[model samples]
Target: EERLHYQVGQRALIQAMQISAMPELVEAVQKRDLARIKALIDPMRSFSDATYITVGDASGQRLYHVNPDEIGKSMEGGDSDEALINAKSYVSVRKGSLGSSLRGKSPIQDATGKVIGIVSVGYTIEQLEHH
Candidate 1:
Protein backbone atom coordinates (compact mmCIF):
# COMPACT_ATOMS: atom_id res chain seq x y z
CA GLU A 1 0.00 0.00 0.00
CA GLU A 2 2.75 2.39 0.94
CA ARG A 3 4.66 1.62 -2.21
CA LEU A 4 1.67 2.26 -4.40
CA HIS A 5 0.96 5.56 -2.73
CA TYR A 6 4.54 6.66 -3.18
CA GLN A 7 4.35 5.95 -6.89
CA VAL A 8 1.15 7.92 -7.17
CA GLY A 9 2.78 10.80 -5.38
CA GLN A 10 5.69 10.77 -7.79
CA ARG A 11 3.38 10.74 -10.81
CA ALA A 12 1.39 13.59 -9.33
CA LEU A 13 4.53 15.66 -9.00
CA ILE A 14 5.39 15.00 -12.62
CA GLN A 15 1.95 16.12 -13.68
CA ALA A 16 2.29 19.27 -11.63
CA MET A 17 5.62 20.00 -13.27
CA GLN A 18 4.21 19.54 -16.75
CA ILE A 19 1.43 22.03 -16.10
CA SER A 20 3.78 24.44 -14.40
CA ALA A 21 5.94 24.55 -17.48
CA MET A 22 3.23 25.73 -19.81
CA PRO A 23 4.24 29.12 -21.13
CA GLU A 24 0.69 30.38 -21.28
CA LEU A 25 0.03 29.20 -17.79
CA VAL A 26 3.10 30.99 -16.45
CA GLU A 27 2.12 34.11 -18.28
CA ALA A 28 -1.41 34.08 -16.95
CA VAL A 29 -0.28 33.32 -13.42
CA GLN A 30 2.34 36.07 -13.47
CA LYS A 31 -0.41 38.55 -14.10
CA ARG A 32 -2.69 36.90 -11.51
CA ASP A 33 -5.17 36.63 -14.34
CA LEU A 34 -7.70 34.26 -12.94
CA ALA A 35 -10.00 34.23 -15.94
CA ARG A 36 -7.32 33.34 -18.41
CA ILE A 37 -5.84 30.79 -16.10
CA LYS A 38 -9.21 29.14 -15.62
CA ALA A 39 -9.88 29.03 -19.34
CA LEU A 40 -6.48 27.53 -20.03
CA ILE A 41 -6.76 24.87 -17.37
CA ASP A 42 -10.41 23.91 -17.65
CA PRO A 43 -9.82 21.26 -20.29
CA MET A 44 -7.20 19.59 -18.17
CA ARG A 45 -9.68 19.01 -15.39
CA SER A 46 -11.62 16.48 -17.40
CA PHE A 47 -8.73 14.28 -18.47
CA SER A 48 -6.67 14.13 -15.31
CA ASP A 49 -6.91 11.71 -12.46
CA ALA A 50 -6.42 14.55 -10.01
CA THR A 51 -9.14 15.06 -7.49
CA TYR A 52 -8.24 18.69 -7.02
CA ILE A 53 -6.14 20.99 -9.10
CA THR A 54 -5.19 24.53 -8.20
CA VAL A 55 -3.11 27.47 -9.24
CA GLY A 56 -2.03 29.96 -6.61
CA ASP A 57 0.01 33.11 -6.55
CA ALA A 58 3.24 33.73 -4.70
CA SER A 59 1.27 34.71 -1.64
CA GLY A 60 -0.67 31.44 -1.83
CA GLN A 61 -3.97 32.98 -2.80
CA ARG A 62 -5.69 30.61 -5.16
CA LEU A 63 -6.12 31.88 -8.67
CA TYR A 64 -7.83 28.73 -9.88
CA HIS A 65 -9.69 25.87 -8.26
CA VAL A 66 -11.57 22.80 -9.44
CA ASN A 67 -14.46 24.32 -7.58
CA PRO A 68 -14.82 27.74 -9.13
CA ASP A 69 -16.35 29.08 -5.92
CA GLU A 70 -13.07 28.42 -4.17
CA ILE A 71 -11.07 30.58 -6.50
CA GLY A 72 -9.61 33.84 -5.20
CA LYS A 73 -9.48 32.25 -1.76
CA SER A 74 -6.42 31.18 0.12
CA MET A 75 -5.36 27.67 -0.71
CA GLU A 76 -6.07 25.29 2.13
CA GLY A 77 -3.83 22.57 3.59
CA GLY A 78 -0.60 23.13 5.53
CA ASP A 79 1.90 21.85 2.96
CA SER A 80 2.42 24.82 0.65
CA ASP A 81 5.34 26.50 2.39
CA GLU A 82 8.04 24.57 0.59
CA ALA A 83 6.69 25.26 -2.85
CA LEU A 84 5.53 28.82 -2.19
CA ILE A 85 8.40 29.92 0.01
CA ASN A 86 11.35 27.89 -1.12
CA ALA A 87 10.27 27.46 -4.74
CA LYS A 88 10.63 23.73 -4.56
CA SER A 89 8.60 20.90 -6.03
CA TYR A 90 7.37 18.08 -3.80
CA VAL A 91 4.56 15.72 -2.94
CA SER A 92 2.74 15.36 0.35
CA VAL A 93 -0.46 14.16 1.95
CA ARG A 94 -2.73 16.67 3.65
CA LYS A 95 -6.31 17.63 4.29
CA GLY A 96 -7.92 20.23 2.07
CA SER A 97 -11.53 21.02 1.11
CA LEU A 98 -12.02 17.57 -0.43
CA GLY A 99 -10.75 15.78 2.62
CA SER A 100 -7.30 14.20 2.85
CA SER A 101 -5.36 13.88 -0.39
CA LEU A 102 -1.93 13.19 -1.78
CA ARG A 103 -0.78 16.34 -3.44
CA GLY A 104 2.04 17.36 -5.72
CA LYS A 105 3.14 20.98 -5.82
CA SER A 106 5.38 22.75 -8.31
CA PRO A 107 6.62 26.29 -8.33
CA ILE A 108 5.61 28.34 -11.34
CA GLN A 109 8.56 30.39 -12.49
CA ASP A 110 8.89 33.39 -14.71
CA ALA A 111 11.42 33.75 -17.56
CA THR A 112 14.08 34.80 -15.08
CA GLY A 113 13.55 31.58 -13.15
CA LYS A 114 11.94 33.31 -10.23
CA VAL A 115 9.02 31.69 -8.53
CA ILE A 116 5.83 33.59 -9.15
CA GLY A 117 3.11 31.04 -8.60
CA ILE A 118 2.34 27.37 -8.02
CA VAL A 119 0.62 24.44 -9.71
CA SER A 120 -0.85 21.73 -7.55
CA VAL A 121 -2.39 18.36 -8.46
CA GLY A 122 -3.93 16.00 -5.97
CA TYR A 123 -5.57 12.60 -5.71
CA THR A 124 -8.06 11.88 -3.00
CA ILE A 125 -6.87 9.65 -0.17
CA GLU A 126 -9.94 7.49 -0.34
CA GLN A 127 -9.41 6.82 -4.02
CA LEU A 128 -5.86 5.73 -3.43
CA GLU A 129 -6.69 3.66 -0.39
CA HIS A 130 -9.02 1.45 -2.35
CA HIS A 131 -6.51 0.76 -5.06
Candidate 2:
Protein backbone atom coordinates (compact mmCIF):
# COMPACT_ATOMS: atom_id res chain seq x y z
CA GLU A 1 0.00 0.00 0.00
CA GLU A 2 2.70 2.44 1.08
CA ARG A 3 4.92 1.58 -1.88
CA LEU A 4 2.21 2.35 -4.39
CA HIS A 5 1.45 5.59 -2.62
CA TYR A 6 5.07 6.60 -2.93
CA GLN A 7 5.06 5.97 -6.64
CA VAL A 8 1.87 7.93 -7.09
CA GLY A 9 3.23 10.72 -4.98
CA GLN A 10 6.39 10.79 -7.02
CA ARG A 11 4.35 11.14 -10.20
CA ALA A 12 2.30 13.87 -8.57
CA LEU A 13 5.48 15.65 -7.63
CA ILE A 14 6.80 15.19 -11.13
CA GLN A 15 3.86 17.08 -12.58
CA ALA A 16 4.18 19.66 -9.83
CA MET A 17 7.84 20.14 -10.66
CA GLN A 18 7.02 20.60 -14.33
CA ILE A 19 4.47 23.26 -13.43
CA SER A 20 6.83 25.00 -11.05
CA ALA A 21 9.51 24.99 -13.72
CA MET A 22 7.37 27.16 -15.94
CA PRO A 23 8.45 30.76 -16.56
CA GLU A 24 5.79 32.36 -14.42
CA LEU A 25 6.15 29.96 -11.50
CA VAL A 26 9.87 30.44 -11.77
CA GLU A 27 9.19 34.16 -11.56
CA ALA A 28 7.26 33.56 -8.35
CA VAL A 29 10.08 31.39 -7.07
CA GLN A 30 12.66 34.06 -7.83
CA LYS A 31 10.58 36.95 -6.57
CA ARG A 32 9.93 35.03 -3.34
CA ASP A 33 6.18 35.60 -3.47
CA LEU A 34 4.79 32.69 -1.54
CA ALA A 35 1.15 33.73 -1.73
CA ARG A 36 1.20 34.33 -5.46
CA ILE A 37 2.80 30.99 -6.02
CA LYS A 38 0.25 29.26 -3.80
CA ALA A 39 -2.59 30.99 -5.59
CA LEU A 40 -1.15 29.89 -8.88
CA ILE A 41 -1.03 26.33 -7.65
CA ASP A 42 -4.53 26.29 -6.19
CA PRO A 43 -6.02 25.02 -9.42
CA MET A 44 -3.33 22.43 -9.89
CA ARG A 45 -3.67 20.92 -6.42
CA SER A 46 -7.20 19.85 -7.24
CA PHE A 47 -5.83 17.23 -9.61
CA SER A 48 -4.91 15.19 -6.55
CA ASP A 49 -5.59 15.23 -2.84
CA ALA A 50 -1.91 15.82 -2.23
CA THR A 51 -0.19 17.73 0.54
CA TYR A 52 2.22 20.66 0.39
CA ILE A 53 5.15 21.38 -1.88
CA THR A 54 8.15 23.60 -1.09
CA VAL A 55 10.59 25.91 -2.83
CA GLY A 56 14.17 26.35 -1.70
CA ASP A 57 17.41 27.80 -2.90
CA ALA A 58 20.66 26.03 -3.61
CA SER A 59 21.72 26.86 -0.06
CA GLY A 60 18.56 25.14 1.19
CA GLN A 61 16.51 28.18 2.08
CA ARG A 62 12.73 27.80 1.94
CA LEU A 63 11.43 30.61 -0.25
CA TYR A 64 7.88 29.37 -0.63
CA HIS A 65 5.33 27.27 1.23
CA VAL A 66 1.64 26.81 2.11
CA ASN A 67 2.81 27.61 5.64
CA PRO A 68 3.83 31.23 6.05
CA ASP A 69 6.48 30.58 8.66
CA GLU A 70 8.32 28.17 6.37
CA ILE A 71 10.10 30.92 4.48
CA GLY A 72 13.65 31.96 5.23
CA LYS A 73 14.36 28.63 6.87
CA SER A 74 17.25 26.43 5.73
CA MET A 75 16.16 23.10 4.29
CA GLU A 76 19.40 21.30 3.48
CA GLY A 77 18.80 18.93 6.37
CA GLY A 78 15.35 18.05 5.10
CA ASP A 79 14.09 15.94 2.18
CA SER A 80 15.50 18.47 -0.29
CA ASP A 81 19.10 17.39 0.15
CA GLU A 82 19.03 15.04 -2.79
CA ALA A 83 17.93 17.71 -5.25
CA LEU A 84 19.76 20.53 -3.55
CA ILE A 85 23.09 18.74 -3.35
CA ASN A 86 23.24 16.03 -5.94
CA ALA A 87 21.65 17.99 -8.78
CA LYS A 88 21.51 14.57 -10.40
CA SER A 89 18.92 13.23 -7.99
CA TYR A 90 15.55 14.87 -8.69
CA VAL A 91 13.08 12.78 -6.71
CA SER A 92 12.80 10.81 -3.49
CA VAL A 93 10.51 9.45 -0.78
CA ARG A 94 11.47 9.76 2.85
CA LYS A 95 10.27 9.93 6.43
CA GLY A 96 9.68 13.21 8.18
CA SER A 97 8.57 14.42 11.61
CA LEU A 98 4.95 14.09 10.67
CA GLY A 99 5.44 10.82 8.76
CA SER A 100 6.66 9.49 5.45
CA SER A 101 6.06 11.31 2.17
CA LEU A 102 6.91 11.16 -1.51
CA ARG A 103 9.14 14.06 -2.55
CA GLY A 104 10.33 15.26 -5.94
CA LYS A 105 12.39 18.36 -6.66
CA SER A 106 13.32 20.33 -9.76
CA PRO A 107 15.92 23.01 -10.29
CA ILE A 108 14.88 26.61 -10.98
CA GLN A 109 17.06 28.64 -13.25
CA ASP A 110 17.21 32.18 -14.47
CA ALA A 111 16.91 33.52 -18.02
CA THR A 112 20.67 33.41 -18.20
CA GLY A 113 20.46 29.73 -17.37
CA LYS A 114 22.04 30.00 -13.96
CA VAL A 115 20.54 27.67 -11.38
CA ILE A 116 18.75 29.59 -8.69
CA GLY A 117 16.67 27.20 -6.55
CA ILE A 118 14.53 24.09 -6.38
CA VAL A 119 10.90 23.22 -5.91
CA SER A 120 10.23 20.15 -3.79
CA VAL A 121 6.76 18.67 -4.07
CA GLY A 122 5.18 16.01 -1.87
CA TYR A 123 2.18 14.05 -0.72
CA THR A 124 1.89 12.67 2.78
CA ILE A 125 0.79 9.07 3.35
CA GLU A 126 -2.39 10.34 4.97
CA GLN A 127 -3.20 12.55 2.02
CA LEU A 128 -2.65 9.74 -0.42
CA GLU A 129 -4.81 7.36 1.58
CA HIS A 130 -7.59 9.92 1.84
CA HIS A 131 -7.46 10.50 -1.89
Candidate 3:
Protein backbone atom coordinates (compact mmCIF):
# COMPACT_ATOMS: atom_id res chain seq x y z
CA GLU A 1 0.00 0.00 0.00
CA GLU A 2 3.04 2.25 -0.31
CA ARG A 3 1.82 3.75 -3.53
CA LEU A 4 -1.50 4.42 -1.89
CA HIS A 5 0.37 5.91 1.01
CA TYR A 6 2.33 8.09 -1.34
CA GLN A 7 -0.79 9.22 -3.07
CA VAL A 8 -1.96 10.53 0.29
CA GLY A 9 1.29 12.27 1.01
CA GLN A 10 2.10 15.98 1.11
CA ARG A 11 1.64 16.68 -2.57
CA ALA A 12 -1.52 14.67 -2.53
CA LEU A 13 -2.71 16.48 0.58
CA ILE A 14 -2.32 19.80 -1.18
CA GLN A 15 -4.21 18.51 -4.17
CA ALA A 16 -6.81 17.12 -1.83
CA MET A 17 -7.24 20.61 -0.41
CA GLN A 18 -8.33 21.55 -3.88
CA ILE A 19 -11.50 19.71 -3.03
CA SER A 20 -12.37 22.75 -0.94
CA ALA A 21 -13.13 24.42 -4.21
CA MET A 22 -16.19 22.21 -4.40
CA PRO A 23 -18.39 24.92 -2.93
CA GLU A 24 -17.60 27.20 -5.82
CA LEU A 25 -18.48 24.48 -8.27
CA VAL A 26 -21.78 23.90 -6.50
CA GLU A 27 -22.55 27.57 -6.59
CA ALA A 28 -21.89 27.70 -10.30
CA VAL A 29 -24.21 24.76 -10.81
CA GLN A 30 -26.89 26.35 -8.69
CA LYS A 31 -26.76 29.38 -10.92
CA ARG A 32 -26.73 27.13 -13.99
CA ASP A 33 -23.47 28.73 -15.00
CA LEU A 34 -21.91 25.96 -16.98
CA ALA A 35 -19.07 28.17 -18.10
CA ARG A 36 -17.99 28.92 -14.57
CA ILE A 37 -18.05 25.28 -13.66
CA LYS A 38 -15.92 24.52 -16.67
CA ALA A 39 -13.52 27.24 -15.72
CA LEU A 40 -13.15 25.76 -12.25
CA ILE A 41 -12.30 22.27 -13.43
CA ASP A 42 -10.38 23.21 -16.53
CA PRO A 43 -7.18 24.19 -14.78
CA MET A 44 -6.73 20.75 -13.27
CA ARG A 45 -5.90 19.50 -16.74
CA SER A 46 -2.72 21.54 -16.72
CA PHE A 47 -1.66 20.46 -13.25
CA SER A 48 -1.71 16.68 -13.40
CA ASP A 49 -2.76 13.79 -15.59
CA ALA A 50 -5.58 12.69 -13.36
CA THR A 51 -8.30 10.71 -15.02
CA TYR A 52 -11.29 12.76 -13.91
CA ILE A 53 -12.78 15.25 -11.47
CA THR A 54 -16.48 14.97 -10.91
CA VAL A 55 -19.29 16.60 -8.99
CA GLY A 56 -22.21 14.48 -7.90
CA ASP A 57 -25.51 15.46 -6.36
CA ALA A 58 -26.47 14.55 -2.81
CA SER A 59 -28.35 11.56 -4.10
CA GLY A 60 -25.33 10.49 -6.13
CA GLN A 61 -26.47 11.91 -9.45
CA ARG A 62 -23.59 13.43 -11.35
CA LEU A 63 -24.09 17.11 -12.05
CA TYR A 64 -20.93 17.75 -14.01
CA HIS A 65 -18.52 15.16 -15.37
CA VAL A 66 -15.17 16.44 -16.59
CA ASN A 67 -12.48 14.24 -18.02
CA PRO A 68 -9.54 14.91 -20.30
CA ASP A 69 -10.89 12.83 -23.17
CA GLU A 70 -14.60 12.53 -22.48
CA ILE A 71 -16.73 15.38 -21.26
CA GLY A 72 -20.40 15.77 -20.31
CA LYS A 73 -21.11 12.10 -19.78
CA SER A 74 -24.00 11.35 -17.40
CA MET A 75 -22.99 9.12 -14.53
CA GLU A 76 -26.58 8.06 -13.86
CA GLY A 77 -26.42 4.47 -15.06
CA GLY A 78 -22.81 4.20 -16.05
CA ASP A 79 -19.65 3.32 -14.15
CA SER A 80 -20.51 5.82 -11.41
CA ASP A 81 -22.92 3.53 -9.63
CA GLU A 82 -20.51 2.64 -6.86
CA ALA A 83 -19.32 6.22 -6.49
CA LEU A 84 -22.88 7.42 -6.27
CA ILE A 85 -23.53 5.03 -3.48
CA ASN A 86 -20.37 6.14 -1.76
CA ALA A 87 -21.35 9.80 -2.03
CA LYS A 88 -24.64 9.12 -0.33
CA SER A 89 -22.95 7.31 2.53
CA TYR A 90 -19.71 9.22 3.01
CA VAL A 91 -20.44 10.94 6.28
CA SER A 92 -21.24 7.70 8.06
CA VAL A 93 -18.22 5.71 7.02
CA ARG A 94 -15.08 5.46 9.09
CA LYS A 95 -12.04 7.23 7.74
CA GLY A 96 -9.26 5.04 6.28
CA SER A 97 -11.47 1.98 6.26
CA LEU A 98 -11.08 -0.77 3.68
CA GLY A 99 -14.41 -0.25 1.96
CA SER A 100 -13.69 3.50 1.81
CA SER A 101 -12.75 3.21 -1.82
CA LEU A 102 -16.41 2.51 -2.49
CA ARG A 103 -18.29 3.86 0.53
CA GLY A 104 -16.18 6.82 1.49
CA LYS A 105 -17.60 10.17 0.53
CA SER A 106 -16.65 13.75 1.30
CA PRO A 107 -19.65 16.02 1.37
CA ILE A 108 -19.59 19.32 -0.42
CA GLN A 109 -22.12 21.28 1.53
CA ASP A 110 -23.61 24.65 0.85
CA ALA A 111 -23.96 27.69 3.11
CA THR A 112 -27.10 26.25 4.58
CA GLY A 113 -25.10 23.26 5.83
CA LYS A 114 -26.83 20.94 3.43
CA VAL A 115 -24.87 18.68 1.20
CA ILE A 116 -25.27 20.00 -2.30
CA GLY A 117 -22.94 17.54 -3.93
CA ILE A 118 -19.93 15.32 -3.62
CA VAL A 119 -16.72 16.30 -5.29
CA SER A 120 -14.53 13.36 -6.18
CA VAL A 121 -11.13 13.14 -7.81
CA GLY A 122 -9.84 9.86 -9.17
CA TYR A 123 -6.49 8.68 -10.47
CA THR A 124 -4.64 5.48 -11.15
CA ILE A 125 -2.18 4.50 -8.42
CA GLU A 126 1.30 3.99 -9.83
CA GLN A 127 4.70 3.06 -8.44
CA LEU A 128 7.43 5.58 -9.06
CA GLU A 129 11.13 4.89 -8.71
CA HIS A 130 12.83 6.35 -5.64
CA HIS A 131 15.87 8.56 -6.07
Which prediction has the highest TM-score against the true structure? 1
Stretches of model 3 off by over 4 angstroms after superposition: 1-3, 9-17, 21-23, 67-105, 126-131
lDDT per prediction?
Answer: 0.86, 0.67, 0.47
Model 2 C-alpha lDDT per residue in residues 66-129, reported as the tens digit of each score: 6667678876446665555555335666775435777667777778766677776677766565
For residue 40, model 1's alpha carbon misses the true position, in angstroms, by: 1.3
Task: Please write out the lDDT profile of model 3 over residues 27-52, one tens digit for every residue.
Answer: 87566565676787768645654444
Best candidate, lDDT? 1
lDDT of 1 by residue, 1-131 (tens): 44638878998899999999999999898777888998888888778878878899988889999887888888767688899888899998887888888888999998898888899999987877564
- Model 2: which residue pairs collide? none
Instruction: Indicate the residue-level lDDT of 28 in model 3.
Output: 76
The superposed Cα distance between candidate 2 and the true structure at residue 82, in angstroms, equals: 3.7
Cα lDDT, model 1, residue 80: 88
Candidate 2 ranges with C-alpha deviation above 4 Å: 1-6, 76-78
RMSD of candidates 1 onward, in order: 1.8, 3.2, 6.8
Error of 2 at 36 (Å): 2.7
In terms of lDDT, model 3 sits at 0.47
Which consecutive 10 residues in model 3 have the weakest lDDT in total? 90-99
Candidate 1 regions exceeding 4 Å error are 1-4, 129-131
